[PDB]
Amino acid sequence: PAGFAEKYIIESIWNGRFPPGSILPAERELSELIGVTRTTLREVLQRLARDGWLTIQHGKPTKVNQFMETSGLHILDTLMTLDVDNATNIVEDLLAARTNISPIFMRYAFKANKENSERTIKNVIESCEALMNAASWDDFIASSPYAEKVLQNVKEDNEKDEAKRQEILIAKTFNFYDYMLFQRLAFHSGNQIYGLIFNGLKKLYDRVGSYYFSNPASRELALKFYHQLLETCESGQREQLPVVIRHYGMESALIWNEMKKQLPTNFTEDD
């Protein structure tokens, strides 16, 4: 469908066919270039510029935008699918950014939204511990109030190898609750921009977590981290919050630094 057009124009800016300083060709020459309907080319080439790839103003032609000068956070996940060997750098940026800003929005959340923060952390802890103790993923999800949302986000029930299907589904479900924790606390901070940051980063977040949380050590470390966050909020021990986060940022990074050596085949996937 239109995905052929969008992914073609996007990929042809990454392989030097239409560099970020070049002009994009005519309307009809592009609609003719790889065989796309006129009006669909109009209405997805327009929205390929709303993502920050292009700049189209009336009269003057359409011009390819510079690298990362206009695009938002979404671009990162797109850049994961192109050129495998910069994905690691993107993941370092994600982990480092989350570790950097978590003490701010979490101290705000613990101060102004103590009870809501505690309820969120308790829900995440209970769901993660129920999933880790379940006999299978189908058993946890059959009895989970988050079943439908998880199924929206954990769309993988297609693998024919049932054991690896189990591992992948456990990882994606745990990542569902990890994201829920960070994003919801970000909104609990009282500043919507932090939550919106995670919202913009969600696709990259889930791609990273679907592999990262396939390691049992990652899940146990995250679980200890959640319990520590809950204890910090409940006790009002403010000075403990940056230390906890700091430690968790380090150790998790180390785990990633090892798992990075064996990235799965699918990890850099065009959707």
Separation between Cα atoms, residue 36 and residue 247, nearest integer Å:
52
Instruction: List, in order, residues 6 or more apart from 255 with CB less than 8 Å away.
Output: 212, 215, 217, 218, 221
State the Cα–Cα distance between residues 159 and 89, nearest whole angstrom: 29
SS3 for 13-25 is HHCCCCCCCCECC
Interface mask toward its own copies for 145-164; x: CB under 8 A: -------x------------
Helix (H) or strand (E) holding 62: strand 62-64
* Residue choice 69, 85, 161, 271 for contact with its own copies (CB under 8 A): 69
Q: Which of 3, 61, 190, 216 binds Ni ion (CB under 5 A)?
A: 190
Which stretch, 86-94, 138-146, 166-174, 244-252, contacts its own copies (CB under 8 A)? 86-94
Q: Using CB under 8 A, pick the residue from 54, 181, 195, 207 that binds its own copies.
A: 195
β partners of residue 23: 63
Using rule CB under 8 A, residue 44 touches its own copies: yes
DSSP-derived 3-state class of residue 22: coil
Q: Which of 114, 200, 221, 234 touches its own copies by CB under 8 A?
A: 200
Q: With binding defined as CB under 8 A, does residue 68 bind its own copies?
A: yes
3-state secondary structure of 156: coil
Of 24, 101, 170, 171, which lies in the binding site for its own copies, with binding defined by CB under 8 A? 101
- Select from Ni ion, its own copies, none the partner in contact with residue 12, using the beta carbon and a kind-dependent cut-off of 5 to 8 Å: none
Residues 144, 127: contact at Cβ < 8 Å?
A: yes
- Choose the binding region for its own copies from 9-17, 97-105, 109-117, 258-266 (rule: CB under 8 A): 97-105
Which letter does DSSP use for residue 136 in this model? S
C-beta neighbour count of 249 within 10 angstroms:
19
Q: How many CB atoms lie within 10 A of CB 52?
A: 16
Nearest approach, Cβ of residue 232 and Ni ion (Å): 22
244 touches 232 (CB < 8 A): yes
Q: Report whether 255 contacts 213 (CB < 8 A).
A: no
Q: How far is the CB of 13 from its own copies (least distance, A)?
A: 17
Query: Which of the listed partners (its own copies, Ni ion, none) does 47 bind, with a CB threshold of 5 to 8 Å by partner kind?
Result: its own copies
| Other beta carbons within 10 Å of 214 | 20
Binding partner of 70, given Ni ion, its own copies, none, CB within 5-8 angstroms per partner class: its own copies
**How many residues of this chain interact with its own copies, rule: CB under 8 A?**
39
Q: CA 5, CA 151: separation in Å to the nearest integer?
A: 29
Please identify, among the stretches 93-101, 111-119, 156-164, 223-231, the one whose residues bind its own copies according to the rule CB under 8 A.
93-101
> Please, which of residues 36-95 interact with Ni ion by CB under 5 A?
93
Select from 41-49, 115-123, 168-176, 248-256 the region that touches its own copies (CB under 8 A). Answer: 41-49
Closer Cβ to Ni ion, 111 or 224, answer by number: 111
Under the rule (CB under 8 A), what is the footprint of its own copies? 2, 39-40, 43-44, 47, 52, 55, 57, 68-76, 90, 93-94, 96-97, 100-101, 104, 152, 187, 191-197, 199-202
